[PDB]
Antibody, heavy 215, light 212 residues
Framework: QVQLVQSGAEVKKPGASVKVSCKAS????????INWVRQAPGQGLEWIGW????????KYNEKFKGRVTMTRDTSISTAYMELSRLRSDDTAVYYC?????????????WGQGTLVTVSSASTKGPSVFPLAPSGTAALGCLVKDYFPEPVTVSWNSGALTSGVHTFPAVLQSSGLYSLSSVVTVPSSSLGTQTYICNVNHKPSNTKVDKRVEPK | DIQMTQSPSSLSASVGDRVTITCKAS??????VAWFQQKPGKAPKALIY???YRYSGVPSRFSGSGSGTDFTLTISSLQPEDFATYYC?????????FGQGTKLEIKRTVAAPSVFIFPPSDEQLKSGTASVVCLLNNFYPREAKVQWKVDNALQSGNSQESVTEQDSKDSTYSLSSTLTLSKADYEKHKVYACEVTHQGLSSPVTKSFNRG
């Protein structure tokens, strides 16, 4: 079936430009529009524009006209969306999509999405701090001051999965993100069983295993 | 730009129920309306084109209708997989414009949160910042109020909240309230308490500690 593969995540500073790619396969690349829509964190969908790969013609949302350029390389079945003069409110997941409407089916196809982070912040691994437990007890890890997203959190190297809650990150006013991961465990195993939270942060090659112990 | 107003912004329903979402256009859009489904972390999925026609693979419990300015999506026989956010979209004229969206969440019995408070670690205190965490675990419905008190002074502006998506097994939520202070301001005070109210609690639940 038709598939759209997008380029990887990107971090950009205000004013810079970004160029996202959309690799299509499974259909005649030159016969259908590629549309681009974006979604800011926790917001709705916003349409950017489309490009017809057959003749390179385009159509842009007035909101972005003069600031966006869509391109296509037919030899590799790839369309591009370039957004210039980036501002913080351009931070979002960007999607390309197309639509095949034939006699016996009508179907939309989508890329996996590309995260573009527009921030003056610079890469920094997370500081991990224990949330020490006080029949059912709660303990966790505070993953604070990291950039950019994402971090990945597991417990006991993936063993402990029942009762785990990892909260969505929130952007602190310092430009850095922060989240907490917590787990409820039997209050009786506090002094015998050992609890380790594993925090991955690929952008910084950071890998922390912080043991959380009752203080 | 034609504005698409969706109603309601949020909606709770039980499995098997029938739901109606509406969407008003600021101008006439004929029947050039599309409907989309989106689950967290995934791309949107098309449901309806031309206001009333289903894209291939969309089951019959999704039906759209309307013309001109008023449009509705009707989802009967709700399945657990149908609980997500839905968007209307006009494509009559440019630019294409979406509604603000409707999040549909599963109704279940009320469940009171379990409250835990966490003082900042000494490790973090060395860094100069103190973060106090209040945890509300496995509760329904989602609306829950947290109050941070330090020496009995209501805190404003220095806390952020983060709530998980609805749990896939029990349909509860959990919530996190983090109070960030300067190490100095953390040293100047003794009693730290978070107070929780919620439909599952007949009176407020308080959790507190004294620095020390």
């Amino acid at each position: 079936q038709v598939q759209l593969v997008q380029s990887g995540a990107e971090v950009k500073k205000p004013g810079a430009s970004v160029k996202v790619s959309c690799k299509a396969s499974g259909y005649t690349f030159t016969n259908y529009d590629i549309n681009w829509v974006r979604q800011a964190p926790g917001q709705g969908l916003e349409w950017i524009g489309w490009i017809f790969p057959g003749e390179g013609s385009t159509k842009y949302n007035e909101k972005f006209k003069g600031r966006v350029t869509m391109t296509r390389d037919t030899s590799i079945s790839t369309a591009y969306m370039e957004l210039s003069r980036l501002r913080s409110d351009d931070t979002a997941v960007y999607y390309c999509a197309t639509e095949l409407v034939k006699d016996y089916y009508a179907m939309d196809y989508w890329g996996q999405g590309t995260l573009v982070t527009v921030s003056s912040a610079s890469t920094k691994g997370p500081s991990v701090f224990p949330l020490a437990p006080s029949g059912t007890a709660a303990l966790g890890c505070l993953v604070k001051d990291y950039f950019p997203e994402p971090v990945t959190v597991s417990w006991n190297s993936g063993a402990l999965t029942s009762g785990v809650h990892t909260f969505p990150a929130v952007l602190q006013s310092s430009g850095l993100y922060s989240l907490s991961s917590v787990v409820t465990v039997p209050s009786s195993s506090l002094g015998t069983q050992t609890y380790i939270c594993n925090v991955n942060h690929k952008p910084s090659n950071t890998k922390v295993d912080k043991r959380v112990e009752p203080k | 730009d034609i504005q698409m107003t969706q109603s309601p912004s949020s909606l709770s329903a039980s499995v098997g129920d029938r739901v109606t979402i509406t969407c008003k256009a600021s101008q006439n859009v004929g029947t050039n309306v599309a409907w989309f489904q989106q689950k967290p972390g995934k791309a949107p999925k098309a449901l309806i084109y031309s206001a009333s026609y289903r894209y291939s693979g969309v089951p019959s419990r999704f039906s759209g209708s309307g013309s001109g300015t008023d449009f509705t999506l009707t989802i009967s026989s709700l399945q657990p997989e149908d609980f997500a956010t839905y968007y209307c979209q006009q494509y009559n004229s440019y630019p294409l414009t979406f509604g603000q969206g409707t999040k549909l969440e599963i109704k279940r019995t009320v469940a009171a949160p379990s409250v835990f408070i966490f003082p900042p670690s000494d490790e973090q205190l060395k860094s100069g910042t103190a973060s106090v965490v209040c945890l509300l675990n496995n509760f329904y419905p989602r609306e829950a109020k947290v109050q941070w008190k330090v020496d009995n002074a209501l805190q404003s502006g220095n806390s952020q909240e983060s709530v998980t998506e609805q749990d896939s097994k029990d349909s509860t939520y959990s919530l996190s309230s983090t109070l960030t202070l300067s190490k100095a301001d953390y040293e100047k005070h003794k009693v730290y308490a978070c107070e929780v109210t919620h439909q599952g609690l007949s009176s407020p639940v308080t959790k507190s500690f004294n620095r020390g």
